[PDB]
Every structure is written in C-alpha cells, then in structure tokens.
Write a protein that binds this ligand. Structure first.
Ligand code: HEM
Ligand code: HEM
Ligand code: A1A4U
Ligand code: A1A4U
Lengths: 428, 428
C-alpha cells in the first residue's frame, strides 16, 4: 500500500513501515507541508500511517476538487473516529446525510439572519469593554484569548440559543497508525470528545435562532440527538475559532503599531463619537477587512483542506485512485513566495482594492471553497469585526516584556501560539 | 443500534447485547430462517452481532431489490474480511470495481464459449466412469463427493486454464460479533483463506479459456494480482458447488428409484447406444432438467441472498434505512407450504412444463437474480448434466447400510450433509 505514489510517478518523502511519514510531523503540519511544497513542487504524496494522502497546489486542480467535482467525487473529508453520535455532525457527516444537513442549516447565516444578530451581539461587546476596562486600571499584561473567548462564548450561546451569561497530541497519534482501531473504539462508546463533556450537553440541549431554526424545519427531516450534535459543532466553532483569530489579530496590531492607528482612524471615521457598530457600517470599513484577511493569511486556523476521493478520476490530466485523501496545504500556499512578495511580513495592503485582484481565490482559502466551505464564514467575519470595532474604539494595544516576539506557532497539532498572547492595554 | 427494528415496527426475535441473535444459529441458518418465516410472516429483522439484517419474502419486494434497484441501492453484498488481495474478487468487489469485473468476465460463459467446452469436458467423464468402474468391481459403498470432486476439479482446471490431471465454524463466529476487528486483521495479512493456500496460487497462476479471455481483455483494464483472485473464485466455485449438488442429486435418485429409472430411460432415448452427450442433446433432456431443478430447490447451496442497502429507500411501501443488510431466505422460501405442496418431498414433477408456470422465479432462486446473480449458472447446469448423463448411462445407484436416511443437513455453516453421501453402485 506504500507503493501507490511510486507507481503513479508522484514524488514524495520515503515512508517508513506502519508509520508512513508521520515522524515528519515533529515540526507540525505547517513546516512539513512548506518543506514538501519546496521539495517536490506542484504535487506530492505521503502516507498518514497506511492512508495515502495526495497534496495538490494547482489552482485549477484545487478549483476542480473543491468546486467542480464536489457533489460527485470529493464530497466527504477524511474519516474521523471514534465519534459516536457525533457522526451525524455536519462537519463529520457524509454523502446524502450531509447534503440534507447542509441544506437544513444553510438559512441560519443568511444576510437577514445575521442582521438580526447585530443588536443582540452589541451587548456583550460592552461586557467585553467593561471586562477589559478593569484590567486596564490594573495596569498589567492581559491574556487576550481569555477575555476574547469569554466574549465569544457569550455570543455563540445567545446567537443560536439565546442564553445570557457574563462569562467571568497524546492519543490521536495512535489514530492514524491504527485507523483499524477506530471501529474498535466506536463499539466501546469511547469518544475523542470526553463522554462527560458531551453528557453535560446530551441533556443541556434538551435542557434548552439556530436552535429555533432546527425544530421549525423538523415539524427526511431533522432528529433530536442529531440536533445536539450540530449544537456542539456550532458552540465549539464560534468559541475557539473566533477567540483564536482575534488573538492573532491583536498580536499583529501590537507588533505593527502603524496599522493599528490607521485602523483606529477608520473606526472613528465611520463611527464618530464612538458610535455603535451596525451591520451596514461594518461592511463599509475596508481597512478593517484588510487587517482581517491578512491575519487569516498568516494564520489559517484550519491549515489544510481535505477531501476523500470516492472513485477513480483523471482531474486536470492527473489520475487519482479511489480512496486517496486529497489535501490542499492552505498554510503552505498562504506563504508561497511564488504568489506573495515577502510572505512572512504582515502587510494588509495585499487586500486593498488596488491589489486584491492579483490574488487567486484558490490559493487564499481561509474558509475553504465549494459546497463544503465554512458554513459560518459570514458570521465569523461579522462577529470578529463587531468585536474589533468596539475594542479598538476604547483601547490601544502595546507589547509587554513577556510578549512572545516573534510569535512561535504551536509545533503541535492545531494552529495556536505556543505561549498565550499577552499584551498591554491602554485606555483612550 | 439494537432498537432499529423496534423503531421501524418490524417484528423479530429479541437480540442479546453484543451477540445480537447469533445464539439462534445453533440449528443453522436454515432452521433459524424457517422458524423466523413462520414466527413473524412476510418481513422480519434480526442482528448479526451489531449488524441489522432485514429478511424480505415478498416476490415484488425481492424483485425490487435483486433486479429493479440493483445498480442504485443494492449493488454489493455483506462486507467480508479479512480478505487481503481477494478484495478484488468479483464475488467480493463492490460498486464500480464490480461493474468493471462483471463486464470483463461476462463473455466467458456465453452460449458459444460453453459449446466449445463440451468436447473438452467429454474427456474426464470417461475418467469419471472408469474411476467409478473400479469401485464397481470392489462391490462396496462409494463416497460420491470424492469421485465427483475429482471429476469437478478436472473440469475447472481445463475449462479455464486447460491443465490436464487425473485427479486420483471455529473463527468466523468472532467475525460477526467483532466486525470492528476485520480492519485489524487486514493490516496483519491475516486471511480467512490460509496464506499457504493462496501462496500456492499467488505463483501458480503466474505459473500458467477463462485464463485466455482475461489477458486478451487486458492488452480501466485488468490487472495481474486481480487475475489470480478471480481464478481462486472460479476454481472453488466449479469444484465445491458442482461436487456438492451432484452428491445431493445422486442421493435423491437412490432414495427415489422410480425417478432414477425414468431418468435413465430418457438418457438412452436421446442418446441411444450410450451416445456421447453433446451441447444440443443436453438441453433436450427435460426430465434431467426437472431432477436438477428439484434438487436445487431442496438444497440451494447458498441458502441466502444478501444485499447491502447503500442509501435510504422506501421500496414497495416499506422504508429501509441506510446500511441494513437485506437478506432473502432462499432455503426458507424453497420449503414454504404457502407455495409448495408437501414441500419436504422430492418431486421433480414440480418443474414439468405442465407445472413449471405456477412457480414464482423470485421464490425459487437457486442462482440468485438480477445483475449480480450466479455468473456461472449456465456452465454449472451444463457441467452437472454432462456428468449425470455419462454416469447414469453406465451405473445405477442404491442406498447402503451406512447411507444416511433421512439425510441430515449440516447444522453448521454451509449447506452440506453431516455424514458424507455414500451409496452402492452397480454396472449396467
Ligand atoms: C475565523 C473563523 C473561521 C474560519 C477561518 C473557518 C474556517 C473553516 C474552514 C477552512 C472550513 C473547511 C472548508 C473546507 O473543508 O472546504 C470550515 C468548515 C466549517 N465551519 Fe468554519 N471557520 C470559522 C468559523 C466558523 C464558525 C463561527 C462557525 C459556526 C457554526 C463555523 C462552522 C463550520 C462548519 C459547520 C464547517 C463544516 C462545513 C461542512 O462540513 O459542511 N466555522 N471552516
Ligand atoms: C449448482 C451450482 C451453483 C449454484 C447453485 C450457484 C449459486 C450462486 C448464487 C445463489 C449466487 C449469488 C446470487 C446473488 O447473490 O444474487 C452465486 C454467485 C456467483 N457464482 Fe455461483 N453457483 C453455482 C456454480 C457456480 C460456478 C460453476 C461458478 C464458476 C465461476 C460460479 C460463480 C459465481 C460467482 C463469481 C458469483 C458472484 C457473482 C457476482 O458477485 O457478480 N458459480 N452463485
Ligand atoms: O468537526 C470538527 N471540526 C469542525 C467544527 C468547528 C470548526 C473549526 C474550525 C473551522 N470551522 C469550524 C472535528 C471534531 C470536533 C472538534 C471540536 C468540537 C466538536 C467537534 S472533526 C472534522 C474535521 C473537518 C474540519 C477541519 C477544520 C476546519 C473545519 C472542519 N476534520 S479533521 O482533519 O479530522 C480535524 C483535525 C484537528 C482539528 C480539527 C479538525
Ligand atoms: O467469494 C465467496 N463465495 C463465492 C465464490 C464461489 C461460489 C460459491 C457458491 C455459489 N457460487 C459461487 C466467499 C469467499 C471465498 C470462499 C471460497 C473460495 C474463495 C473465496 S465471500 C462472498 C459471499 C457471496 C456469495 C455467497 C454464496 C454464493 C455466491 C456468492 N458472501 S458470504 O455471506 O460472506 C459467504 C459465507 C459462507 C460461504 C460462502 C459465502
């Protein structure tokens, strides 16, 4: 099974028995793909244990997989287990089960449903400023992801269910070499999500908007244990992703103060006298969008986009056998000098309307693409921008003595910083 | 997972944890289905371990699964492992891999390719008579399956490769309760077919008609390790199935002597002076066909026909969820008094042209139905009839003191007799 890429004439690192190429993950997914992208070029292959993974970097080939041949060949991602009842989660579901869930949950982030959330979100931002105004007086370093995650959790519980609360690898290493053990753990009720975290919610969702828009579309319809599984996906997505990217954004503004002031100038221009950010004023701030896009270029929290080839195909002149996991190294593409001038530098001017057109939307894919892209892309941009407006309207951010500069990425599994992002906060 | 049939309102025996209903297999598949068919009626369900199995007995519902909705919903059988390289076997392959193999191997049993085999098969029948003429003088009991299997092996090695040779459960119980262990054994090279039997052939096929018609259609084509896997399927199919049914036929002729004489009378009528059976004279003997069909009714070696439901459907007014193994109890249907008068009695007159029309071809399915039926159905009927003609032309068969009457079926896994079939042979 380890000769599939030698057979197909596809270059790649030499795999070891059983382990495949997993030992190369010692520097993390990001550094591995960046090297592989430089070592072999447009297309290479490797083996996650016994699982062959093909990495494509051709924009036409990427557009073919994510968009053109999604409903037919590349519908589902890499299988993930043990999941239990979470198999019905939309990010985990497959084939016709996914198409039904994606349609049922797609009217949750329409342009109208998001506009109803701006008056609701506008509450915890003041809780966010007032929670940040107390550490301000304390005159000391601040952990951003804590006060951001506390804010982000307040938004996700209310935008989907409406609960108001003031919010104040070790084992997956064996999953990839033992994917045959995944069916074993599914019959033991073993779950990668600890069974006490889910049991805290296997009744809490029954113990309770997105929650409204599910039973209303239940009345070939929606179940109830699956309703809990979608809540878990949304609750995690709105918490961790929003807080993590906001931590990355405030770090870049602190280490690049000129961008922070020019951002504060536009915020006070569209919203004078510290005006409350509305839906229409958020989409007007283009420099805010440029700061958001550039930070997502340097830190695409997903790193990779993956699809399982479900039958033999010959896309863009290359045969791909059945079962191969097609992977797009998003972190590697976002830092390729063959597309980005001085790629390691934070430059929001890449996304100005003077330069936003020299950017392939199949190289810069922080939210994926095609029918399986990030379903909450428009909410996440809105939720973060409403948070950046209300915070930068009141505070400036400076690095501290303990601030990690340059920021070391987590050499581990998911895209996070090694040391938590701490900065000094000053009141305007 | 054990409440799927309570949810759907489908009757069936109460399953035990983990085991499901496998403890009911203590009398064999046949007695279990016969009781279930009487206990619940037209449709029931049970659990092979954790695998839900739905048993249908409605001819329209059976025709819908085997024929009408084969290419779409019920393409593949129950997954079988560990198989190794035998996953590419046509009886084991799935989806588009199977459709390619079924088309590539379908021109092997055409009406013309079989007609070329009659002059070749006509050799070992004389080896069969001469091997039976020696025990004749010995004047003692004879094991039919030995001299039939020796004959059947001579035919299968020459009709497909042309090699001339004078040919003179314990562990699957854990497969069904541990289907999660099947992926484990696939990575250990563990095989339900002992690796020394296959290694005896992983080179013997390379160390060597059906074999011709494979490389000629190779020239999206056919491989080589897969060529060996198809040889193993054919070599077993032509040996065990032919020898086993021939053992059943000669037993029924011995315990019903009037049928044996009336059969010998027609053989000498179409072929006077002990004429060599040709292709056209075999299809003329209708009483020979009636004896073959009736024995296959009492002993359908497959017992069951199974299909895996690959997506949600509502066939003939009944919803069937994704993943359910749809099973047709062939042994149970062949003995249902609601279709057969005095079902336990051997009566070839059921298949006379006066009565062959009061028989539903979706109740009597000894070779399956639809695009996935027995690919070697026409060869097996021809191979057996050429053997029955040449043997009944020279010998009569009487029961012995050690002959098992009534014949006890193997209470185990596959449809065989408990004691081997032994009879006395006399020369005409
Ligand atoms: C900065 C914030 C976020 C980023 C960068 C992000 C990024 C992504 C990416 C790259 C994918 C995979 C796309 C693909 O495979 O083609 C994805 C999928 C997904 N995202 Fe997000 N996401 C963010 C926030 C959110 C939020 C707030 C939600 C709220 C529900 C969410 C829900 C989902 C879901 C359910 C999927 C699975 C899509 C499917 O399987 O149909 N994400 N996201
Ligand atoms: C008395 C003799 C035989 C009987 C009663 C018999 C019966 C059957 C049955 C019931 C099936 C399954 C049909 C279904 O699932 O719908 C089958 C499949 C099959 N049979 Fe036979 N068979 C016999 C002899 C043979 C012979 C001589 C061959 C020679 C190659 C053969 C090759 C196959 C194959 C390859 C399949 C798998 C079909 C597929 O997956 O496409 N059989 N047979
Ligand atoms: O549902 C999951 N996540 C998406 C939900 C939240 C989210 C995150 C980021 C962007 N938008 C939304 C994963 C299981 C999970 C985790 C925490 C809470 C609940 C469930 S499992 C499927 C992934 C696909 C995937 C990957 C990346 C982004 C989106 C979707 N595939 S993955 O390779 O195994 C993997 C490995 C390590 C971390 C994350 C995912
Ligand atoms: O290829 C196999 N057999 C068919 C080949 C010969 C044959 C037999 C009868 C009729 N025509 C042809 C099985 C594996 C095998 C066995 C011996 C040698 C080589 C390979 S494995 C798929 C079966 C489907 C199936 C069942 C019954 C009849 C035809 C096809 N499915 S099964 O439920 O697991 C099972 C369980 C116990 C015994 C047999 C099969």
């Amino acid at each position: 099974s380890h000769g599939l890429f030698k057979k197909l004439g596809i270059p790649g690192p030499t795999p070891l028995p059983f382990l495949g190429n997993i030992l190369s993950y010692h520097k993390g997914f990001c550094m591995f793909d960046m090297e592989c992208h430089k070592k072999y070029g447009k297309v290479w292959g490797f083996y996650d244990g016994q699982q062959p993974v093909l990495a494509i970097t051709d924009p036409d080939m990427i557009k073919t997989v994510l968009v053109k041949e999604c409903y037919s060949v590349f519908t589902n991602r890499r299988p993930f287990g043990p999941v239990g009842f979470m198999k019905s989660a939309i990010s985990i579901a497959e084939d016709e089960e996914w198409k039904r869930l994606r349609s049922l949950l797609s009217p949750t982030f329409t342009s109208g449903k998001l506009k109803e959330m701006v008056p609701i979100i506008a509450q915890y931002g003041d809780v966010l400023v007032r929670n940040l105004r107390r550490e301000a007086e304390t005159g000391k370093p601040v952990t951003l992801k804590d006060v951001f995650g506390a804010y982000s959790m307040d938004v996700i519980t209310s935008t989907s269910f409406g609960v108001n609360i003031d919010s104040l690898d070790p084992f997956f290493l064996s999953i990839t070499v033992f994917p045959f053990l995944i069916p074993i753990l599914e019959v033991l009720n073993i779950c990668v999500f600890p069974r006490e975290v889910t049991n805290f919610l296997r009744k809490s969702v029954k113990r309770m908007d997105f929650l409204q828009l599910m039973i209303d579309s239940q009345n070939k319809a929606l179940s109830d244990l699956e309703l809990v599984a979608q809540s878990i996906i949304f609750i995690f997505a709105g918490y961790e992703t929003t807080s993590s990217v906001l931590s990355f954004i405030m770090y870049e503004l602190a280490t690049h103060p000129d961008v922070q002031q020019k951002l504060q100038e536009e915020i006070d221009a569209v919203l004078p006298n510290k005006a409350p950010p509305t839906y229409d004023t958020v989409l007007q701030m283009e420099y805010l969008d440029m700061v958001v896009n550039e930070t997502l270029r340097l830190f695409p929290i997903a790193m990779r986009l993956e699809r399982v080839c479900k039958k033999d195909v010959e896309i863009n002149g290359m045969f791909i056998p059945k079962g191969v996991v097609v992977m797009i190294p998003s972190y590697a593409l976002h830092r390729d000098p063959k597309y980005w001038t001085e790629p390691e530098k934070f430059l929001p001017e890449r996304f100005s309307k003077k330069n936003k057109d020299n950017i392939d939307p199949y190289i810069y894919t922080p939210f994926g693409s095609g029918p399986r892209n990030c379903i909450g892309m428009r909410f996440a941009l809105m939720n973060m921008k409403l948070a950046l407006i209300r915070v930068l309207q009141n505070f400036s951010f400076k690095p501290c003595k303990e601030t990690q500069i340059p920021l070391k990425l987590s050499l581990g599994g998911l895209l996070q910083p090694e040391k938590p992002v701490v900065l000094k906060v000053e009141s305007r």
